[PDB]
Structures are given as structure tokens and as C-alpha cells.
Symmetry: D2
Subunit: 124 residues, 4 copies
Amino acid sequence: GRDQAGITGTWYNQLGSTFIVTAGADGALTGTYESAVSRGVRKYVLTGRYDSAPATDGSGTALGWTVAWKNNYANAHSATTWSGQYVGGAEARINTQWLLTVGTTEANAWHSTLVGHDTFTKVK
Amino acid sequence: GRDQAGITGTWYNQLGSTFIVTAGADGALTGTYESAVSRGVRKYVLTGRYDSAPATDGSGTALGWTVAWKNNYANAHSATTWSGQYVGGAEARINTQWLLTVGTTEANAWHSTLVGHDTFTKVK
Amino acid sequence: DQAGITGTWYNQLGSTFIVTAGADGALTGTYESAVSRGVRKYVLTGRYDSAPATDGSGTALGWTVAWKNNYANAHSATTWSGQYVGGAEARINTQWLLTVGTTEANAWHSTLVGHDTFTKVK
Amino acid sequence: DQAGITGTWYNQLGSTFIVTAGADGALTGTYESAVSRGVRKYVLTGRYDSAPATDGSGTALGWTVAWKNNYANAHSATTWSGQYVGGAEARINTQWLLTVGTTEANAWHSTLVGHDTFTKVK
């Protein structure tokens, strides 16, 4: 993976959330997420995918991952997906937009999905 | 997983895309996606997560998954995340909203992310 | 066009969108949400492409409702972005963003996203 | 309020949003995008909560730009949904939806999503 080295490691967003991820050569993302907003009780499993061979034209690397907000300790009956791109260099960043869907009845489904944006940096 | 049985299997969206997924007891989603829009050359790996213990109050099951649009045959330098909920019963459905991010230069990043919505059914 | 757009539209929730499309690209009207009479009517304003591409493309448009009227204030605003498609099964296909006034701490939870399809028959 | 909102705002792209907020909740103005003079100015209309919650919450608002003017037509419309926060570092924090007129076949690819932060100094 071109950016396997670049992506693997600890990232921090503008909320102070911590995203720990290993990028496989096959395009796999695996790791843990800890949200600053709502320790092992605050860590949730993440899986996702990234482009292992980006276009060498200065483009970022497209990627995405999901966290379902259930662990051994708590269950918030919701899942967030982040969609964005990794940009390498001195101020390496993951620029994302996210969707947070909560389990609802059919009547409440219209109010089920939050949208936002997180920027991840290598320094907190 | 409460809906491990319900989620596992083949799903079809309003575009005719085919989503093949196995739901693990630990909340893992794994499988393949084939988009009707842009065979083994058209299959892409998906990973994701779902709530393995939803609230028993009639709520859907929150879930998400990612497809990076690279396989052994093609690379579209992009990733889609779907965020939504599974609803069981006679007309079982996965109601999703999605984000499709393409690798771009910093100048083009403003134009990097499409948003949409897919409804998956068990019949095409 | 202005002919196709002007009039009464209904979404999958049973909400009612009453809109007049001006020659200048203006949308003006009232929105009534099935979810949250005159107590449930809110002012909408917006814009549409008054000269769409004549290649069978839809007509791009958007409008905003702030959820304050003489009776109620929900300290929120929805914008719909989408396109009008004419013909026998005329439709406005939209995605929307609903933002509630929050403190800085709650801003991350401030915006709902969804999609509404409006038809000329409920 | 109408005082805080009325005036000139700049986003992280260098785009310029000129808006007047009416007492009735109306937004009227012009938008000039840094990306895609009078040839680059487009009409905007929108709404804001004219009586926000006095608990330190932002003021919900939205507006629409259809990308047609006397000079150019890009067959598209953007809506911004967000909130105004007053004080020394006054801001309009938004998410937006950009929809282009497409055929039914291309509708799946019709809508871009993003986020713009507007400040009183560029």
C-alpha cells in the first residue's frame, strides 16, 4: 500500500477524539476509535477500506471506516461512517465527512441521521 | 447477534446494485458489493459494523459499511460509506444514506464528496 | 419551468410544499411538515435554474424553511437541495439538511441529513 | 440577530457572502464563489430564526444560490444550512448540498456535500 505507512498510527480530530488505525496492504483498515463526545470502556472497534494505489497526480487517498457504538461496556444503538481522504506530507491530514445513524422506529427514521465533518491530524 | 440471521445474505438497492454481506456475532460486517452504476471484475470488498444488540423497542439496527472502489481489475480512486439501519419483518429493508469521496488535489477537495441514499431489499 | 414548479407538492411523509416560481429564479411559498393548519405553516424562500439544460436534465433548485412562525419557534432551519423533473410523473427529488441552534459543545450533533421526494399527488 | 448577521462574510475558500437579514426572518443578498466581479455574483435568498434561544445557542439559518446570473448558467443550486454564533470571533458554521441538473441515469451522482465556515475577516 502506497500510504500504508502514512495512514497506520494514531490520529486526533478537532473534538480531541482519537482514531488508532492499521492499514493493510490489501486496502483493509482496522483499529479502535475513542470519541471525546457522546479508556477501554470508551474504545470501539473500527473497520474500513482505503485505496492502496492512489493516482500519483497529487490526489489524496480515498478511504472510509465505520464504528458501531457498542463495546463490552456500553451500547448507544448507533453507527458512524467517515468518508474522506488521507493527504500525506509535513501536515498529514485525514479530511472526512461523516454520517451518524441511530436505531429508530419507522416514524422517527426522518430524524435518524446526523451529518458532520472531522479533520484528523497526527498531533492533538 | 439479534439480527445476525436477518442481515446475512444478498440485498438489492433501487439502482439494481447487489450487496452480499455476512454479519458476525461480534458486530462485524464483511462481504462484497457490485454497483449497477459507475461479475468478479465488478465485485469489491466491503467491511463494516452493526449493533449486535439493538433496543427491543421496535427500533431498527444501526449499521454502516465501506467499499473502496479498487479490486484486482480496476481502481476508481474512491470510497463509499453507507450509514443506516436494518428493519426486519416481511418487507425487511436496509435504509441508508451514503458518502462517496474521490481522491482529489487540495484545490478540488470542495468537489470531492457525493451524498445519496440507497434502500436495500431482499428481492430485486 | 416556472409552470411545472408552481403549485402544490407532497412528500413521502405527507408534508405539503406550496411554491410559486418567479421568472427571475425566485421560490416563495409555505411548507407544512407532517412531522416535528396556519399554526403548522412556515414561510419558504429559495431559487431554481430558470433556464435548465434542454437535454432531459432536471432543473436544479433549493429552498429554506426556518421553523419559526407566529405560533411556534423550533430554533432550526431546513434546506432542501435537488431537482425538478417534469412529465406525467413530475417530481422534486431532494436531499435536505436540518440544523438546530446549539451551544458550541453540542454543535457536532447540530445537523440532520435526509431526503424527500415531492409528487403532485400525495 | 439581524445586526450580527447583516453584512459581509468570507469562507475558507475565499468566497464572499453579502447578506441582509430582515426582521421577518428573510435572508437576501449575493454570493461570489472563489471556485467553480458582477459576472461572478449570484442572488441568494434564505431564512434565519429571528428569535433565537437566549441560552448561548447559535441562530439556525439557511440560504440557496442557483448558479445562474445574466452571464453564466451552471444548471446547479447550493443550499447552506447552519448557525450564526456572535461574539468577538463571530461565525456562520454551515454544511451545504450542491445539486446539478442531471438525467435520471446520472441522478445518483447529482449532489455534492461539504461544509463552509464564514468569518467577518477573510
